[PDB]
Design a protein around this ligand. Structure first.
Ligand SMILES: CCCCCCCCCCCCCCCC(=O)O
Length: 133
C-alpha cells in the first residue's frame, strides 16, 4: 500500500460512462459521473488500516479498511456492496460485489502517475491520476 499513499488528482477518464451504464447508474448520476474529476487521498491509519477518500463537486466519499478483510462499502452511486482490497505484485486489487455485478478495480502506480482500471463484465475503463503530494 505504501506506493499508493498520498493525494492524487484525476487527469483523464475513458470508458467510465460504459461502466456506469452496465452497473445501472441512473441518467442524472451518470451525467454527474462523466463530468467530475475527483481527488483520491490514500492514508495510512496505523495497525494495518488504511483510508481512501475521494473529493469532488458531487460529494466526499471514503472508506477505511484492512487488506484481505471483507468489508461493507457504499459506492458513490449508493449501491451497498461487499468489498475486498488486497495488493499483489504492486497492484491494488479492489473488488465490489453488488449482488448483480462484481466491479473489479486495479490501481497501479508508476512514478507520478496512478492508473485505475475499472472492469464490469467485458467493459473496461481507465482513469489516470497525477500525484499532487
Ligand atoms: C465521483 C463520481 C461518482 C460517479 C458515480 C459513479 C458510480 C460508479 C461506481 C464505480 C466504482 C468506483 C470506481 C472508482 C474508480 C477510481 O478510483 O477512479
Amino acid at each position: 500500500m505504501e506506493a499508493f499513499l498520498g493525494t492524487w488528482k484525476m487527469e483523464k477518464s475513458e470508458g467510465f460512462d460504459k461502466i456506469m451504464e452496465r452497473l445501472g447508474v441512473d441518467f442524472v448520476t451518470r451525467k454527474m459521473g462523466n463530468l467530475v474529476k475527483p481527488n483520491l487521498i490514500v492514508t495510512d491509519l496505523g495497525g494495518g488500516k488504511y483510508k481512501m477518500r475521494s473529493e469532488s463537486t458531487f460529494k466526499t466519499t471514503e472508506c477505511s479498511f484492512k487488506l484481505g478483510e471483507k468489508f461493507k462499502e457504499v459506492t458513490p452511486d449508493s449501491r451497498e456492496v461487499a468489498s475486498l482490497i488486497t495488493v499483489e505484485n504492486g497492484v491494488m486489487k479492489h473488488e465490489q460485489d453488488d449482488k448483480t455485478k462484481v466491479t473489479y478495480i486495479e490501481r497501479v502506480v508508476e512514478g507520478n502517475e496512478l492508473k485505475a482500471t475499472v472492469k464490469v463484465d467485458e467493459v473496461v475503463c481507465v482513469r489516470t491520476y497525477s500525484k499532487v503530494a
